[PDB]
Amino acid sequence: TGRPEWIWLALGTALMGLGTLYFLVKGMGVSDPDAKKFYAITTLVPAIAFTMYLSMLLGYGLTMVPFGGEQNPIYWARYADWLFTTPLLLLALALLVDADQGTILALVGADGIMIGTGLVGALTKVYSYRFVWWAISTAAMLYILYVLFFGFSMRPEVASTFKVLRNVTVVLWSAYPVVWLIGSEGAGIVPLNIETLLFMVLDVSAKVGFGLILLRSRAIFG
Amino acid sequence: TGRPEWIWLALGTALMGLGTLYFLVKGMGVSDPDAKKFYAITTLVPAIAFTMYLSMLLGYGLTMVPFGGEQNPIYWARYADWLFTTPLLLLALALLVDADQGTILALVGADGIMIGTGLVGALTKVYSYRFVWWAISTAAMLYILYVLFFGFSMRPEVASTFKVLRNVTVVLWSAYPVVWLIGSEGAGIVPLNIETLLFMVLDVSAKVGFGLILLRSRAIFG
Amino acid sequence: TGRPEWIWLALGTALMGLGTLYFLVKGMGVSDPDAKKFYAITTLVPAIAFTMYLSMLLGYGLTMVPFGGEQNPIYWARYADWLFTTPLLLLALALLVDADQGTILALVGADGIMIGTGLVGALTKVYSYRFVWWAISTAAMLYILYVLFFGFSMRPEVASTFKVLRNVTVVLWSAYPVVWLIGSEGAGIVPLNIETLLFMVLDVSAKVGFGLILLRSRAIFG
Numbered sequence: 316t317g318r319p320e321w322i323w324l325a326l327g328t329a330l331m332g333l334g335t336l337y338f339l340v341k342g343m344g345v346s347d348p349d350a351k352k353f354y355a356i357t358t359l360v361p362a363i364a365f366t367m368y369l370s371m372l373l374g375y376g377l378t379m380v381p382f383g384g385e386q387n388p389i390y391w392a393r394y395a396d397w398l399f400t401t402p403l404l405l406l407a408l409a410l411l412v413d414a415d416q417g418t419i420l421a422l423v424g425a426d427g428i429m430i431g432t433g434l435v436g437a438l439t440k441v442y443s444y445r446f447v448w449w450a451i452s453t454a455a456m457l458y459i460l461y462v463l464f465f466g467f468s469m470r471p472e473v474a475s476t477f478k479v480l481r482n483v484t485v486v487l488w489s490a491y492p493v494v495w496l497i498g499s500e501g502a503g504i505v506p507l508n509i510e511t512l513l514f515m516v517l518d519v520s521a522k523v524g525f526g527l528i529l530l531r532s533r534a535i536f537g
Numbered sequence: 538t539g540r541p542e543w544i545w546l547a548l549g550t551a552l553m554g555l556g557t558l559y560f561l562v563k564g565m566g567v568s569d570p571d572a573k574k575f576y577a578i579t580t581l582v583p584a585i586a587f588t589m590y591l592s593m594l595l596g597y598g599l600t601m602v603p604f605g606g607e608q609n610p611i612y613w614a615r616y617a618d619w620l621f622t623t624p625l626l627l628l629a630l631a632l633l634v635d636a637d638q639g640t641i642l643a644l645v646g647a648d649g650i651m652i653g654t655g656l657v658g659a660l661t662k663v664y665s666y667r668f669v670w671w672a673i674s675t676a677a678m679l680y681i682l683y684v685l686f687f688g689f690s691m692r693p694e695v696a697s698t699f700k701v702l703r704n705v706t707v708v709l710w711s712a713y714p715v716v717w718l719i720g721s722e723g724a725g726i727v728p729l730n731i732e733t734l735l736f737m738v739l740d741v742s743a744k745v746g747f748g749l750i751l752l753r754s755r756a757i758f759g
Numbered sequence: 760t761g762r763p764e765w766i767w768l769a770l771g772t773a774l775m776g777l778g779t780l781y782f783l784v785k786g787m788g789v790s791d792p793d794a795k796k797f798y799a800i801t802t803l804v805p806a807i808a809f810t811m812y813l814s815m816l817l818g819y820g821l822t823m824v825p826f827g828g829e830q831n832p833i834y835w836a837r838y839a840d841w842l843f844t845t846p847l848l849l850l851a852l853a854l855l856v857d858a859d860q861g862t863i864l865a866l867v868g869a870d871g872i873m874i875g876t877g878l879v880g881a882l883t884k885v886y887s888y889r890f891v892w893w894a895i896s897t898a899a900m901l902y903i904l905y906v907l908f909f910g911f912s913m914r915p916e917v918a919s920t921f922k923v924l925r926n927v928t929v930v931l932w933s934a935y936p937v938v939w940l941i942g943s944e945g946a947g948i949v950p951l952n953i954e955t956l957l958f959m960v961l962d963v964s965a966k967v968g969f970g971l972i973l974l975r976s977r978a979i980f981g
């Protein structure tokens with residue numbers, strides 16, 4: 316279509332789709348109750364992303380927000396995606412270390428605050444206020460990274476896989492606020508097709524690569 | 538009012554209302570923790586449906602979507618309903634067989650994908666794309682029916698009630714994609730008043746009849 | 760700004776903000792798994808409220824609804840807030856008395872029905888129907904108060920704290936339907952700046968004061 320970023324959305328659609336099917340087939344036969352939690356999470360995440368990538372590709376998950384006296388194309392469907400996939404990803408890490416329920420509730424809650432404020436900043440028509448929402452969202456992310464790092468006699472397999480998955484998370488999630496900031500939702504320093512490209516690379520690595528690393532460890536089994 | 542289907546919405550409103558009160562009174566006195574889960578679910582489902590049937594009757598849960606160069610009346614409130622009641626119904630079956638948590642998460646996740654994609658197809662302005670969303674939703678339903686059928690030393694009361702409730706589910710839920718397809722959200726082969734009528738009969742049977750069958754078995758008690 | 764109620768929104772924003780940070784710092788060091796559930800809840804609630812109070816202050820959580828041949832300013836962001844904070848508050852009480860899961864599901868479900876119908880009444884363009892939604896919401900609240908009162912060998916610390924927190928709840932929550940009824944969402948007998956003021960006093964007491972009382976008892980620890 317006439318949207319330069321269409322190619323990255325089609326590509327993202329394809330990659331999330333293939334990853335979903337891949338995890339689906341791989342989870343076939345799993346009977347371990349613990350492993351079943353990781354397969355479910357690991358398959359559900361790209362499955363949701365696929366649908367949200369498809370609605371962006373078809374034009375449904377897109378809206379125009381006026382600001383800076385311009386009509387800016389905002390892909391709201393990413394928040395619909397993140398709203399469910401990021402807490403699911405956080406659950407995988409938490410089941411991993413057998414996190415206390417209070418901690419999980421804190422993470423999920425901070426995460427929803429994180430995505431919900433980013434969405435409000437994304438749709439805000441007063442330019443300066445967009446960055447206020449961006450800051451609160453960022454504060455929520457730092458909270459989460461903090462607990463991932465400092466809130467966590469576990470099996471050496473568990474820790475070993477956790478450290479890896481936790482380093483992956485901190486590095487890939489921290490990039491999202493930067494893309495947003497430099498991208499069309501914020502300062503507009505990077506054009507929307509490049510921004511969509513960056514998010515597509517982060518999403519697939521945060522979702523497919525994360526699940527491949529996760530589904531490789533024996534830490535997921537009881 | 539001037540909407541021929543008003544009668545089925547009023548009737549559905551009434552039936553969900555009466556069923557709610559019926560289950561409410563019947564659940565009075567229940568102290569068994571397990572039974573309390575089924576009563577809660579069984580009462581909550583028609584309670585939600587009542588509210589969504591009432592907003593359709595009053596005109597709130599209705600919106601016009603343009604497609605095929607026409608202005609089509611779409612009852613979005615059904616998805617608001619289904620979004621919560623279908624996973625609750627799936628929970629009753631899963632508690633029944635004492636399903637593993639990983640399986641429940643898979644079912645709820647597929648279910649949300651199922652209703653969320655159907656809603657997007659319902660609101661999509663490009664005619665052909667409506668059917669793409671319809672197909673993905675259908676694929677999610679088949680997944681669910683698959684696990685209900687093939688993902689499931691349980692008490693003979695449990696199995697016995699499960700088989701019945703599971704046959705009911707497969708038969709009534711499979712009809713929804715067909716109604717949508719033939720109805721005003723899809724090919725428009727069946728007029729909206731007939732479609733609302735069909736959904737009302739499915740909803741009450743899927744909700745009230747399902748709960749009557751459920752609340753009759755001793756399988757729900759510990 | 761040009762909205763007389765801005766001062767109460769700024770003030771509410773400030774108070775929820777300060778309470779969040781206060782609970783955050785106080786929860787530092789907590790290792791008891793049970794206590795962690797109460798701190799998380801107690802911090803998450805004002806944290807969400809802060810964000811919703813800020814979007815009201817900035818004008819984002821506000822919309823005009825026509826009715827009575829007038830264009831009425833409706834703060835929809837309060838429902839976005841309540842939708843998550845009221846079930847969380849109900850969870851604190853339920854963990855307190857160690858409520859059965861079936862009961863919790865009933866409370867959360869009734870609560871969502873309560874806030875969701877109030878939101879629909881809030882956005883309804885037919886004046887008389889607003890009060891129908893108001894009534895169903897009120898019926899859902901009475902249900903909840905009923906179970907809090909009559910659905911509940913617990914530690915004397917637990918009961919003692921529960922009675923207090925339960926008396927607080929019944930008294931503050933029962934005021935919300937009255938404010939709405941007399942306020943701009945209903946009969947319009949009280950102007951919007953006074954209504955916002957009343958809700959701000961209820962919100963801070965229902966959220967910050969409730970959490971201070973809660974976080975004072977040894978009932979929250981194992």
Ligand SMILES: CC(C)CCCCCCCCCCCC[C@@H](C)CCCCCCCC(C)C
Nearest residue numbers: 330333334337515516519520521523524525527
């Ligand atoms: C069987 C396994 C290994 C995987 C097959 C699933 C296929 C789907 C795509 C998986 C891609 C992700 C690899 C890990 C993370 C990233 C660094 C990839 C970023 C995305 C961009 C291009 C990647 C190349 C290709 C996989 C086409």
Ligand SMILES: CC(C)CCCCCCCCCCCC[C@@H](C)CCCCCCCC(C)C
Nearest residue numbers: 552555556559737738741742743745746747749
């Ligand atoms: C005490 C029990 C048995 C039930 C009383 C609750 C009353 C409310 C309506 C219950 C209806 C559902 C019966 C099971 C399923 C269906 C096949 C019914 C489809 C709906 C259409 C008309 C049904 C007739 C009537 C119940 C008015």
Ligand SMILES: CC(C)CCCCCCCCCCCC[C@@H](C)CCCCCCCC(C)C
Nearest residue numbers: 774777778781959960963964965967968969971
């Ligand atoms: C360390 C403790 C005690 C608390 C400090 C947190 C500060 C934030 C505000 C807390 C206010 C709530 C007190 C309990 C409930 C209410 C009756 C208060 C209603 C709100 C209106 C004004 C209150 C005064 C002030 C706290 C500024």
Ligand SMILES: *C/C=C(C)/C=C/C=C(C)/C=C/C1=C(C)CCCC1(C)C
Nearest residue numbers: 433449452453456488491492495521
């Ligand atoms: C599958 C996708 C993932 C893992 C998404 C992570 C997205 C983030 C961590 C988002 C963070 C944001 C903020 C911290 C600042 C405001 C903007 C956001 C929403 C991009």
Ligand SMILES: *C/C=C(C)/C=C/C=C(C)/C=C/C1=C(C)CCCC1(C)C
Nearest residue numbers: 655671674675678710713714717743
């Ligand atoms: C209480 C109502 C119930 C039990 C609803 C079930 C509804 C379905 C199983 C819906 C399925 C759909 C698809 C499979 C295709 C697309 C359209 C839908 C949303 C009707």
Ligand SMILES: *C/C=C(C)/C=C/C=C(C)/C=C/C1=C(C)CCCC1(C)C
Nearest residue numbers: 877893896897900932935936939965
């Ligand atoms: C943190 C805020 C809290 C504790 C909110 C409680 C709000 C209520 C109990 C709301 C009730 C309502 C009804 C009973 C009637 C209709 C209007 C509402 C939504 C205000």
